[model samples]
Target: GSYGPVFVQEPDDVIFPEKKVALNCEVRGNPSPSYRWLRNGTEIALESDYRYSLIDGTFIISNPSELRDSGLYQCLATNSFGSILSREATLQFAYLGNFSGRTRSAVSVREGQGVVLMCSPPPHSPEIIYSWVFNEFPSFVAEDSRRFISQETGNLYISKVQTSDVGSYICLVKNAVTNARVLSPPTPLTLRNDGVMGEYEPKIEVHFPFTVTAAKGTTVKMECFALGNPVPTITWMKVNGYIPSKSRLRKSQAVLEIPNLQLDDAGIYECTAENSRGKNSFRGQLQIFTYPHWVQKLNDTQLDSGSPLQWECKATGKPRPTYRWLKNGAPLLPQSRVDTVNGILAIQSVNQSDAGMYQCLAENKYGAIYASAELKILAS
Candidate 1:
C-alpha cells in the first residue's frame, strides 16, 4: 500500500498566548512513517523541555506561545513508501502585552473620532481588573475622565477623541490569582489640532521628518529644521510645492509640510544650514514606513430583506491589516448571517436593522483608516 503525510489536526486561527496547542500530522505508510516538523524553512529541533515537545507525530506547546512562536508550521513524513510534506499551518498569539514599548508607546488620531488603546497581559488570572492613569510628574500632568475601559478586551476606548484628550495614558493591570499588579508604560495620545476656529499656527519646533523613506499615500510632513542661539535663518532648495514648505524660522526651527505623500515624492531634499559664521547643506530622503491603505472603499448599497448583501473593503499592506466590520458605529460580533474577510464583508439574508451605516476598519502599526457607506434596506 502506498502512503503519504496526511494532516489529522491543525492549529486554530487564534490561540491564546498562554494555552496548550498541538499540531497533529499523522500519516500512513507500508513501513510506518517517521515525522520531522519544520517551521518556516528550518527543521524544528526536539527539545527536552516538556513545554515544547514533539510526541507521536505531533508538535505541541504546553505553555504560552510568544511572538516568535507565530509562524508557518509543516511536517514531513517519510518511509520506504516515499516522503511527503504536509501543508503549512499557521500559529498566532492572540494577545500578549509588550513591557518595554513604554517610552515609545503613543497613538495619534484625528479629533472627534473613536480610538482604542490596546493593552493585553500575557495569559493570567481570569479576574484581572484594569485601570488607567495619566503621566507621572511633580511639575505637570492632569486628570481627565473622558476615557473608559472595555469590559471585554481590557482596552481603553475613547469616543470623540480630542486635543484635550492629549496626555500620557498608562494601563494598570491587577492579577487576582497571583496577587500581583502590572503597569503598561505610558502611551501618549497626540491630538494635533488642525485649528478650524482660527488661523493654523505654525510653530518652529526643532524637529524634522525622520525621512529614511515613506510609504505611498501616507500623510507625511518634513521640516528643514535647525536650532541655536540667535536662531539661524534657514533656506530650502530642490524641493517643490507638492509638499507645502514654510519658514517658521523666527525661533529655533524651520518647517516644511508634506501631506498625503505619494511615491513620486521619493528622493533627496536639500536644505541650507546658515548662520553669521558660514553655511552648510544637509539632505534627507523620504523612506518607507510599513504602510497600508484602502483599495476599494465601501459604497452605498441597498438590499431587500432576506437578500444577500456583498461589499468589499480591499486593502494591501505589508503586514496585512486585521479587518473588522462595524454597523451603525459599533463592532459586529459573530452572527449567523454576517461574516468578514481581509477584503470582503458579506451578509446573508440581510435584516431590517442592517439598514444603517456600515464601516470597514483597516489598521496596522503604521496607521488606521476607515470607510463607511449607508446600508439601506428595502421596505418589508
Candidate 2:
C-alpha cells in the first residue's frame, strides 16, 4: 500500500470575518510530499479577500475572514511518484462582528417565567441581523408580540412554554445574501419545574455494518452510517485498500453505501465520516467468508455438581434453528432431568461427574444445524 500524506487540521469548516480559523492538515508520508490549497474551486491565489495564502500546504484564515471567503477548499499533495487529493474539507460557517458566539439561554426560570432567547450577529458586513423562526418550518417569522419578542436584543422570549410551545426553534442569522441560520434540533420547553434538553441534533444510528457476501463472480453491496452534528461525510474503501471499482451507492437513508461487489472485491471495507467538527471511521471485516451461520458473542453460566449445565444458542440463520442436547450419540429429552429452553440446553445437577463432550445442537428447517461446545460438569 502507498503511504500518502495526512492533514492535521483540514480547512473544511470556517467562519469568515468573524472567527480566525486556520486550515492545518499535517501530512505523513515516506518521501514527504508537496502541498497546495484551493478555495471555492479555484487555486489559492497569492493574495485574496483580506489576505489568504497557501503557506506551504496549510491555508490560513486571517483575523475576520469575511463571508465571501467561505466556500470549497482543496488540499493537493504530490510526491515524486504521483499526487493525491484529500477529500473536500467543508468549512461550515457563521458570521463575525455582531454574532460574537452562539446565542445564550436563560437559566433558573419558573413555570410562568419569561425565558428570553438571545441572538447576536457578529459585527461585519451588511448589518447585525437576527430573527426567530419557530419550528424547523421556515415561514413562521416573528411578526407578532406574543411568543417572539422582536426587540433590539434579538431575543426570542416565551411568556411560558405552554402546552402549545412544543416545537423546533430556529434562529435565522443572516446578512444580505449570506444567509447562515442555526437551529436547535427539537426542544420542548416546559413550564413545569424540571428543565431537560431533548436530543439536540438527534442522531440516527444505521444498524447495518459494512458487509459484502458474494459468490465467486457476483458483486456484493456494502453499507455503513453514523450520526453527526452536521450530517456526516461517507466514503467506501475497497478490500484492495482502495475505493470500490466505481463508487458503491448502496443508497439507504443510512449515509454510506457500496453496490456491485465481485468476489475479489471481498476483503476489509472501511467507511468514514467528516464534518466541520472532525472525523470518525468505522471498519468492517468483509469477505466471501461464508459459514453455516455467524456467532455474535460467547459467554458462560454457573452450574453446581448435580445441577444441569446450560448454554445459549445464538446465530443468524437462513433456516433459523432448533436446539437439542446430545451426550455421545444419544439425545437427551426435556424432562425433570433436562430442560430445553428457546434453544438453550439446560441439564440439572447429576452425580458421577458426567464428564464428556456435551454437544448443544441447533437444527432448523435447513439441514445440518451446528453442534457447538457445551460443557459437561464432573463431580469431585
Candidate 3:
C-alpha cells in the first residue's frame, strides 16, 4: 500500500550486545518527506546523543549499548501536506547468559507434522544459536535436511518429526555476542501414532523402574505400557511364587493391582507384555516397607578340597536391602580364591583356610540384619 510514508526496510529483530548496529528506515512518500526515528514511544533527537546518528533515514549506533537500547523503533515522515508513521520495528538486545524461559518440559507431536522446540531466551536477552540434542549425544539430526535452526528466534524446527525422534531433548542456546551457552532441562519428545496397520513388536514406551514401594494395607498398582500394532496383552507374575490368586483385586490392560496389601505380599513382580510380534518383560519390586526378613538365611555348608563351593544369601526388606559380606568378623575382599556376587559368596578350590564363619549383612533405611553360616572345607 503506497501512502504518505511506507517503510521499505525495517531494522533487524535482534543485534548482539555491545556492538555496532545499523537500522535501515528507507521510506517512500509523495512530495519528498523528511524522516525521524522513535525509540519505544519517545522520539530520538539526532543531536541529543553522540552514540546515535540518523542520516537520510538510516539510523546507526556506535560504541557499546546495553538492553536499555532495545525498543520499538519506527520512522515518522512529514511532507508539505501531512505526516505519517511507519510500522513498528522491534529491536532486541542480545547477550550471553543463562536461559530462563517458560516451557512445557515435554512435547508430543504426530508423525508428518512439524514440531518446533521452543527455546526462547529471557527478556532483553541476546540473539542466540539454537541446537537440539537428543538425550544421549549429538547425531545426524542437526544435519537432518528436515531440521532447521533459527538464530534470531532460538528455535529448532523438525519438519515431520517421526518415531525415531522420540526421546529426551536438551535445547542449547549460545549467545552470539560471547559465544557462551546454556542448555535447557531435558524434555522428552515422543510420538503419537494411529496403529491401524503394521504390527509393531512389543516395545516398552516408558520402561518400568526396577523397584516400587507401597505401605502395608494400601492398594498398589503397577503399569507396563507397550507400543505395538494390535497392542499387547500384559500379564503379571511373581519371581519366587505364583501371582497372588486372591490378592489381585483388579486387572486392566498393562496394569496389575493388589488390594489390602500385606507384609507377606512383598516380593518381585514381573510384567510381561506380549503380542503376535513378540513378548517383553520388566521386573519391579513391590515392598511392604518392613524390616529385613530372610527367605533363605545364610546356612552352613561343607565342600571337599579342590572343588568350588557356593553359598547364597537372600533377604527381603522395605527400602530394598543392600548386601555386604563379612568373613571371620572382617570385610571379605575379592581375590583369586573368593568371589562375591549380589549376596552369593563363591570360593574356588575350597581350601581349609576357607573354613570360617561367613556372614551376609543386609541393611535398608529401616534397619539392618545379618545371617551367618559356618563353611567347613575337608582336605583330600
Best by lDDT: 3
**TM-score-based ranking, best first?**
3, 1, 2
In terms of lDDT, the poorest run of 10 residues in model 1 is: 196-205
Candidates in descending lDDT order: 3, 1, 2
Candidate 3 at 335: error in angstroms? Answer: 99
lDDT of 2 by residue, 1-380 (tens): 33334335444444443445677655555468677676665677645555564556777665544355557666656554334344456665544333334434434444433455554544544444556666656656443222433323445655333456655555655554355444433333445567633312312233234554443334444444444444444555644577655554543322334455444456776666554556666677655522235363223233457665656666655346555554432466665566667667665665444443344454444333333232334455
Highest TM-score against the true fold, candidate: 3
Q: After superposition, how far is residue 2 of candidate 3 from its true place, in Å?
A: 16
Scored by lDDT, model 1 comes in at 0.59
| TM per prediction | 0.30, 0.28, 0.31
The window of 10 residues in a row where model 2 has the poorest summed lDDT is 198-207
Q: How big is the positional error of residue 189 in model 3, measured in Å on the Cα after superposition?
A: 20
Q: Which stretches of candidate 1 lie over 4 Å from their true place?
A: 8-19, 28-32, 47-51, 64-71, 92-380
For candidate 1, write residues 239-262 as lDDT tens digits.
553333422222222434455555
Candidate 3 lDDT over 9-117, as tens digits, reads: 6455555453577777675656566887888767898798788877778788886466557787766665543344544566655566566644556787666545667
Could you give the C-alpha RMSD of every candidate to the true structure, in order shown?
A: 20.6, 26.7, 31.5
For model 2, the stretches where C-alpha displacement exceeds 4 angstroms are: 1-9, 16-20, 47-50, 63-68, 96-380
Give the Cα lDDT of each candidate. Answer: 0.59, 0.49, 0.65
> Cα miss at 91, model 2 (Å)?
3.7
